[PDB]
Amino acid sequence: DRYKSHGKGYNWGNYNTETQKCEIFNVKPTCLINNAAYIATTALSHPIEVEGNPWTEYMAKYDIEEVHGSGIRVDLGEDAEVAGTQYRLPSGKCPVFGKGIIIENSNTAFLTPVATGNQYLKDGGFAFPPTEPLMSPMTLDEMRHFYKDNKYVKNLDELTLCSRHAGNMIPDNDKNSNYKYPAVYDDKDKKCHILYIAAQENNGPRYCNKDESKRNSMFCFRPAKDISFQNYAYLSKNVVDNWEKVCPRKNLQNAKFGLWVDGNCEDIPHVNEFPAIDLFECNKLVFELSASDQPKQYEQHLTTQQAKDIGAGPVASCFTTRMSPPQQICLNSVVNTAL
């Protein structure tokens, strides 16, 4: 459990729109200060959208350690036993708005299906390859029809439903049904993408290769809030069904995070200042600095299972469903062995 952040990190920022300063800090805020120059943001928040302690109830959703409970930039907060081997999995309770993965020196978008059949590893992305019946990608309307006879899921919010759908595929080696894949929901196309690869960062020169001529070598990649990801939500298996009320999403206009002390909201007494031209660029920096469950580079050298420690998952070609009716679903083609 050495790598788990449990949500601790530089998760919050006060963006001064007039001085173009992103004031980043790593303690939970406990009140808000009215100030027309400011917008209050968190690493989980959408990067653009804006809206004896009397603040306790209102500020609960900014207590990231309590309401999310895991990393943000890299979320690998739980372990799942499969056939005697313990794999790392995303486990945060809130959706991460605007997060995606950039594959370095690559044309491949990360929601492209993982390489299968005759494809080289670097030709494919992170998403589930086609299955029969087709499980991913699936649109919202398709998901509600798929689950139309399941009372407990059919009416879930679209993000919670995408999370539960991604969790509806049990690898056939996983007899205790512990392993649940993460997912990305694209609000533009209203599509749920189950992610076959649960890793989110691989940047060590000893463990990845950025050369495009070595197309079966492991590629390098990192999480980011790129402008092209603004409609995505990165979702672990644990996304809660009431995230809309308990998790952050919109940024707070005309508001500065503060700390409640002796009946008054005081300024955060020490912040780390980064320049940022607009709110999106501040949110991107807060995310870059936020809680991470990634092993530090020196820790990846000291382990004998570097791939597992960054989230490498089990080899699975056929699956069974968790929710009724029980059915078997197989990939149309097996994933590239290089994985």
Numbering used by the authors: 3 to 53, 77 to 364
Reproduce text from the manuscript describing this model:
We used structure-based design (SBD) to alter the location of the C-terminus, enabling seamless attachment of RON2L. The SBD1 immunogen is a circular permutation of AMA1 that contains a Gly/Ser linker (GGGGS × 4) between the original N- and C- termini. The DII loop (358-TDYEKIKEGFKNKNASMIKSAFLPTGAF-385) is removed in SBD1 to produce novel N- and C-termini at residues Lys386 and Thr357, respectively. This new AMA1 C-terminus is immediately adjacent to the N-terminal helix of bound RON2L. Some of the residues deleted in SBD1 (360-YEKIKEGFK-368) comprise a helix in AMA1, which is replaced by the N-terminal helix of RON2L (4-QQAKDIGAG-12). This design approach ensures that the RON2L sequence (3-TQQAKDIGAGPVASCFTTRMSPPQQICLNSVVNTALS-39) could be appended without a linker to create SBD1. The SBD1 structure was most similar to the AMA1-RON2L complex, with no major structural reorganization observed and a Cα root mean square deviation (RMSD) of 0.299 over 245 C-alpha residues. All groups had potent GIA against Plasmodium falciparum 3D7, and there were insignificant differences in IC50 among the AMA1 DI-DII, AMA1 DI-DII-RON2L complex and SBD1 immunogen groups. Strikingly, when the same pooled IgGs were tested with Plasmodium falciparum FVO and Plasmodium falciparum Dd2, only pooled IgGs from the AMA1 DI-DII-RON2L complex and SBD1 immunogen groups showed >50% inhibition at 5 mg/mL, and the IC50 for the SBD1 immunogen group was significantly lower (i.e., more potent) than that for the AMA1 DI-DII-RON2L complex group in both strains (P < 0.001). In conclusion, the single-component SBD1 immunogen elicited potent strain-transcending growth inhibition that was significantly better than that elicited by AMA1 DI-DII alone or the AMA1 DI-DII-RON2L complex despite lacking receptor blocking antibodies that prevent RON2L binding to AMA1.
